[PDB]
């Protein structure tokens, strides 16, 4: 069972810094760490590549652009058939679906967007949008791969 550690929205240090490093220490058990919210220190970005030794990041945070050379503004993953279109930012219910189908010329099967801290399985325009909560609200997402399915479990702390 392979498992992706999805971190909803991280701003460290910035003006939060209150991120439980316990999960960061557990990257050993995650053969794929997904970062929708990044660590804003370029130094710590390399440290991320040190702990996880393989991470997939999407930089849509309002911090240092230096980090954007390690993780692009938008990224899609191909996980056992499931096209995961990940994009961190904001958007209205109307704009969201249309904008994401604009950014991604080919429609993603499942899209990850972090902004709301209340998780709901939302199907818009025929696309499945998954929304993880926030950092300091004790909401991280663990994607577990079994039978060739990306299974989203937002686990609480």
């Amino acid at each position: 069972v392979k498992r992706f550690l999805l971190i909803s929205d991280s701003h460290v240090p910035v003006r939060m810094a209150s991120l439980p490093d316990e999960i960061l220490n557990s990257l050993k058990e995650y053969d794929g760490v997904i970062g929708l919210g990044d660590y804003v220190d370029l130094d710590t970005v390399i440290l991320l590549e040190k702990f996880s030794k393989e991470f997939y990041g999407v930089h849509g945070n309002m911090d240092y652009p230096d980090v954007k050379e390690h993780l692009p503004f938008s990224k899609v993953l191909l996980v056992e058939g499931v096209t995961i279109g990940m994009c961190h930012g904001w958007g209205a219910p109307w704009d969201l679906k249309d904008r994401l189908l604009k950014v991604f010329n080919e429609k993603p099967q499942v899209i990850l967007f972090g902004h709301t801290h209340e998780p709901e399985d939302t199907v818009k325009a025929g696309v499945r949008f998954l929304n993880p909560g926030s950092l300091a609200e004790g909401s991280y997402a663990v994607l577990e791969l079994d039978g060739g399915e990306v299974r989203f479990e937002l686990k609480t702390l």
Side-chain angles (χ1 to χ4, degrees), residues 54-135:
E54 188 175 346
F55 65 95
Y56 309 115
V58 186
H59 207 275
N61 180 32
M62 299 297 297
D63 279 291
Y64 302 88
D66 304 80
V67 183
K68 185 176 175 294
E69 295 200 277
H70 295 255
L71 44 153
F73 186 81
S74 46
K75 203 195 198 303
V76 171
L77 307 177
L78 183 63
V79 187
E80 297 177 78
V82 182
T83 338
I84 312 183
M86 307 185 303
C87 289
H88 178 283
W90 54 80
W94 337 298
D95 291 78
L96 186 70
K97 53 187 178 66
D98 279 84
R99 180 183 188 183
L100 293 178
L101 296 177
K102 170 58 184 169
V103 179
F104 290 131
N105 285 329
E106 293 194 79
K107 55 93 188 299
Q109 191 188 331
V110 180
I111 292 181
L112 294 180
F113 72 107
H115 194 92
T116 174
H117 56 264
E118 299 191 270
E120 184 183 292
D121 185 67
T122 57
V123 55
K124 312 296 181 185
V127 184
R128 189 177 186 178
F129 301 84
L130 294 180
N131 41 89
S134 312
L135 202 294

Side-chain angles (χ1 to χ4, degrees), residues 22-47:
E22 309 190 29
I23 202 177
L24 180 65
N25 299 328
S26 299
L27 306 200
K28 311 171 183 178
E29 299 181 62
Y30 293 101
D31 49 275
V33 178
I34 299 183
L36 291 180
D38 57 288
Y39 286 81
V40 313
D41 320 275
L42 187 63
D43 301 82
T44 312
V45 180
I46 282 61
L47 179 117

